[PDB]
Amino acid sequence: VFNATRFASVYAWNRKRISNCVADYSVLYNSASFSTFKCYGVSPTKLN
């Protein structure tokens, strides 16, 4: 979903309902390839 081959338009935005997996958000957080990272209900450090 992040290193995807192709993304879609804004009026036809892709939705993926990701379920049943082990999540880790540190690397997604720690990756400097991502320019805009702002969370709105949870402070990101607690997302681990």
Binding site: N30, A32, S35, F37, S43
Partner: protein
Amino acid sequence: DLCFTNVYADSFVIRGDEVRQIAPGQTGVIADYNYKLPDDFTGCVIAW
């Protein structure tokens, strides 16, 4: 019109994309591994 006891000028160089990182309470690799401000900060920030 104010007077202070001691002044502490801290100067460095960062990447120009990392300016928003320097605010207290922000969270990000520059603000998380090698320079950290307390939330009760009293002073000014200057970047150019």
